[PDB]
Design a protein around this ligand. Structure first.
Ligand SMILES: [Zn+2]
Length: 51
């Protein structure tokens, strides 16, 4: 927090996330945390490890 150059004001937005929430397509449930979305991505994985 003392950069010789301008840190550059990043004023963009990803369209699919919009707000920054990750909405899983084919589901209504969205997660703002990556870990929560990937746990849900594992909830798509029908094959249990300890079945
Ligand atoms: Zn899903």
């Amino acid at each position: 927090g003392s950069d010789r150059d301008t840190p550059s004001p990043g004023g963009v937005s990803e369209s699919g996330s919009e707000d920054g929430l990750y909405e899983c397509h084919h589901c209504a449930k969205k997660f703002r945390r990556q870990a929560y979305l990937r746990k849900h991505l594992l909830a798509h994985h029908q094959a249990l490890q300890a079945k």
